[model samples]
Target: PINVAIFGSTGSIGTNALNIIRECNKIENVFNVKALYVNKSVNELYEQAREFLPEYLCIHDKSVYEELKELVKNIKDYKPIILCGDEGMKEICSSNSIDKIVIGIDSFQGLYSTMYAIMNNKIVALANKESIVSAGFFLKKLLNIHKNAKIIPVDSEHSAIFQCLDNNKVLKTKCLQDNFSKINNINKIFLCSSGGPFQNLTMDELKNVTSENALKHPKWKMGKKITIDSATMMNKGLEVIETHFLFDVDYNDIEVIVHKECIIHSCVEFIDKSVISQMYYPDMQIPILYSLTWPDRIKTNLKPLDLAQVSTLTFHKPSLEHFPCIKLAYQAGIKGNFYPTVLNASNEIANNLFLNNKIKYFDISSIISQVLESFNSQKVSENSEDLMKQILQIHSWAKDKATDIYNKHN
Candidate 1:
């Protein structure tokens, strides 16, 4: 049995991962959950502990560790080792018992842990898109050094590309002295978007959108922050950058299509002049299971799609005028430096402002545009410490800028 460790077991991806594991248990005894980690949500964490009976349990918030400890103590049969804070998360990431690491944490906190896993040469089932977006080039470099380290994307788009590219023999070539080349048939990667709740909304309508309204996504259920980001098309923007790094494809070759049905998760156009697209129901569990049991198939209980029930699947070009976040992401990816980090941070701050009612929905994109325009002239760091410093610097600067712009507008 493979020892599986779940990081951020309280979020949407974490919960779905747990459900997938539960479903996987019925077919075969492949996974032995060794550890579970969460930042908060003690009640949910306690429930997962009781169900999975993991050897290690971690909660990131130090303030409630004692309360969580007491809650876990009430369970009669199991005595799981409990850990707290950043150190606790690091321990889980670097644990010897954990053969597979599912990084579901949503924030930059997972950044170092993910690096630790890759450096240690563990199979990483990654759901944290931020880690890749924030440090793609560095992580790619590390993967090259550590040949045993492997990252299977849990995001639907990258996972689709991974599946479609698995059978092809095309290799990527190196222009150095050794004349080394790896399979590389893919010419372009296409990332599809659902266009979120405001896809059809005018600028005037977006100016009056509420947080509650923005959170109501049409197709898939996601976290509130991501839902808002999707509405602004920032999530799609981040995914575009993510696709470029994950596949080592050029920024120009990565494209986005606004598919309202969302059945076509993503596609790859190979040099053979054929397009391979992964189409399935818009469900997180499918990708979650795909990342875990890659190169092997396991029967799942997830509802299969019925074509007759769904009459039409539509696709169209995304409008940059309506959703500037998509354009911003492409620019960041091509700019290549600390600009992607700045864009991510600026979007985070702007999203928070919108969530708090300090800024209108349209202002989210406007603030991001203003910040990017100012930082477009700046350069990013090539070293890790320097990159982190740049990220921190931009994070602080963007927050202040967002607050200033928000106040002026209000």
Candidate 2:
């Protein structure tokens, strides 16, 4: 049986992971629900704790501890070990009994839990991009010291790449070398993007788009932050950075393709010039399922992908100019150091501003680019030797600058 702990248990990914947990519990020795975590979603946590009956319940927002505690007590048979904040997350992630730690939190917050899990040698089913994108340089270095720690991508694109690489060995391989030569065995990774809700938006039209419209992803259902990231094509850019770090491949070899259909998740072309691709309908559960059952496939009731019924599967090139945040992401990956952290940190505030109706959709890229410009003369580069505190400082600074830019522009 596999025991698991979820770091962010009430969001979209955690919600679905619980769905899988519920289903998996029916099978003998499948998934043992170990812990549930959330951020102020007390009611949702109450429900999950009652159903899953995990041993631990952690709430990041401490104020709701009593509230969640009272509610979870309704389950007469079991009372979970209720704890609050990041410390509890660290505890459960390092627990020897727990086999997997699902990093399902959004943005920079995901980085902390992931860092803790890796250092403690827990396999992580990662849905957080910034954890790898912003913190990757330092995060990667820890892999050598803790070779037992592993990351299986739960996001659709990277999950496809994971399968494409024959359950890629890169996730747990020793990262101490600081240089991975295995890219010599691979060819190119076609990182697919659905082009978001604004795939067809002309430059003039993007100016008129709102957060509501952008959140309406054409293919996949996602949370607000990722939908916004997708609309700006920033998600693809971060994924490009993530693919680079996770697989230890050069940014130049990772090809970003705009696949509007979202039918085939992603593909990797080997050195032999042939491609290996994973196909399924646009469902997060498919990848989530695989992540939970690595190197093993379990039967699921989810809809199957049939090529014949999928009348047309479209593919084309992505125009970074059309989505400047995407262009900025590539620059940050190449300009590694404090750049990725700046790109991720600044963009979070910019996107939140847009989502809260404080700015126009087009302003997101402008705000991030403007924030990044302040650091151009600083000579920031990636260092694998514990640079998190410095990165967080840069992250905080970027948020302020981006917010300052947003307010001034408005």
Candidate 3:
């Protein structure tokens, strides 16, 4: 059985992954839950620990360690080792017992586990897009050295593109190198967006949107940050950068199209002009399952696609006027230095500001743009140690710059 650890074990992706693992094990043991981690949800984390009987459980909130232990003391026959904070997550990810690490944590926080797991040669089922957006430039370099490490994207759009491309089919030629490659057959990659709740809202209308309204996403019950990102279409922008690094596609070759139905997650176009797409009902578990069991398909109780009932699927060009974050993303992505990192870090801060009702919706785009504009490009080397330190520095600088910009404006 493949040993697995879920970093954000209490969140949506973590729970769904555990569900997939549980369903897979109904017939026979397919995965062993080696470790689990969560921020502060001691109850849900404890519940997961009791059921999975993992070897370790990590709580990022150190203060709640005693509370978690109290809850676990009643467990009948299993006693899992409890760990605290990022240090614990690092140890678990680096441990030899773990074969796959599902990095379900949100934002750049997931990058810690991702880097450790890759260095330790573990399969990374990456649900966190920010890690890719922030460190993709460096992660690609790491992949070239850590040949055994593989990153199977859990994001539906990226997964769809991966499925259509079938890069794993040419494993002997490219697998040992970076798992992600700059493919020759692909001419263009289309990342589909649900267009969020503000799909039709004019720029003027968007100016008045409150966090409450923005949180009501038209599709996908995701966490607050991502839902707001979807509303602003910044999520699509981040995915564009992610696609660039993951497939080795040039930023120009990647495009975002608004697809209301979302049945077609994303598609790839070949040099021959033939387009291939991966379509399924809008369910994250499908991609999650595929990430866990890539290069192969498994039977699942998931509801099959019924295009007839849906009948209509539509596509249109995303508006740069309404979604300026897309433009900022492309600009920063093309710049190619610490720019993507700056873009992601600043956006994280700007996103929180909007969520806190301290900034308007459109302020997010301007704030990120200012941060990116203010950054100075410098000489950067490929050494992994230096790269991580430099990336973290840039990340911190961008966050501080963004906060300062927000303060000046307010």
Candidate 4:
């Protein structure tokens, strides 16, 4: 049995992962739940502990440690070690018990856990794009040092592009690139977007939208923050930067297209003008399952795609005027250094404010733009320790500046 540890086990990605693991266990005991971590979902964590009987369970919120311990004690004869807080998370991630680490946690916090897993030379199936977006430079540095560490893409578009390029082979580079050169056969990567609910709406119409309207994504169910990002096309924007780091490709080579069907997750065009696209029904499980079982396509009871019924597939160019966030992402990604970090930090804060009705819909991009404009160069050390310290400091600065901007607007 493959011993697996899942961080953020209570989020949308985690729940689905557990579902897939449950099904995998039913067929045969393929996975042993080594550890699990959740930010604040103590009750749900308890429920997971009862079922998985993992050796280690971690809660990010320190105040809930006693409560979590009490719940764990109730499980007959199964006493899993209870870990708490950020330090506890560090312990859990770096522990030798974890063979495969599923990083389902959102935001920059996931980057630390990812780095820890890499340091220990563990396989990482990453769902947190924000982590990669914000600090992939540092991760690339870590990955170069830890050669055995592997990262399989869990996002649909990324996984699609990965398969098209490598064909189930072992990953070589830190991100998704098999080779680290711009002159590779790949011409352009077409990252498809669902364009969310208001893709066709005018700028004036978009400003009038409520969080409620934006949450109703036409393609699939996801966490609230990402849903809002999708509505603003900022999600695609973040992916643009993610692709830049993951593939080691130039920003000029990455393109975003509006694919309403979402059937074709992403495509790769070779220099020879040939295009390869990965198409499956929009199911997160497919990619998640693939991440767990690589070099072999395992059999599952999940529904297979029926292309006959998915009769209509269309694509269009993304309107830059409708989504300025995409342009801002390109600007930040092209600038390099800590700019992408700032882009991620500010956008996360601004996205939250918009979700809470503290800012208007379009104000998300405006606030992020203001934060990006305020960026200043800093003397950052290349050493991992000092690099992370400075990254966190810069992240805090962006978040605080974004919040201040939101306040001044009101």
Best by lDDT: 3
lDDT tens readout by residue for model 2, 1-410: 88989878887888788887677666645888899888898988888776788998889887888888778767988967888888888888877889898888866668878888888888889888787877776676667668888777887898898777653555434332354426335667899888887777788898889887876534567667878888888889889888888777788888888888888899888778988899887878878888889878876666667888899988988777688887898888888777988998898898899888888876888888888888753443445443676667777888898978877767
On the 0 to 100 scale, the lDDT of residue 131 in model 4 is: 82
Give the residue spans of candidate 4 off by over 4 A: 167-184, 216-219
Candidate 3 to truth, TM: 0.93
Measured against the true structure, the TM-scores of the candidates, in listed sequence, are 0.90, 0.91, 0.93, 0.92
lDDT of 3 by residue, 1-410 (tens): 77889889888999889998898888567889999999999989888888999999999998999999899998999878889987898889788888888999876678877888888888999998888888876787787778888888899998898888654554543321343344446689989999988878988998899889987534678788888899889999999988887777778889899998889999999878999999998888888888877767777776778889989999999999999999999999999988999999999999999999999988999999999989999788668888888988999999999999988877
- CA lDDT, every model vs. true structure: 0.78, 0.80, 0.86, 0.84
Off by over 4 Å in 2: 167-184, 216-219, 377-386
lDDT of 3 at 224: 89
On TM-score, the candidate that comes out on top is 3
What does the lDDT read for residue 224 in candidate 2? 78
Clashing pairs in 2: 337-381, 337-382
Measured with C-alpha atoms, the lDDT of residue 351 in candidate 3 is: 90
Residue 387's lDDT within candidate 4 is 85
Candidate RMSDs in order: 3.3, 2.7, 2.2, 2.3
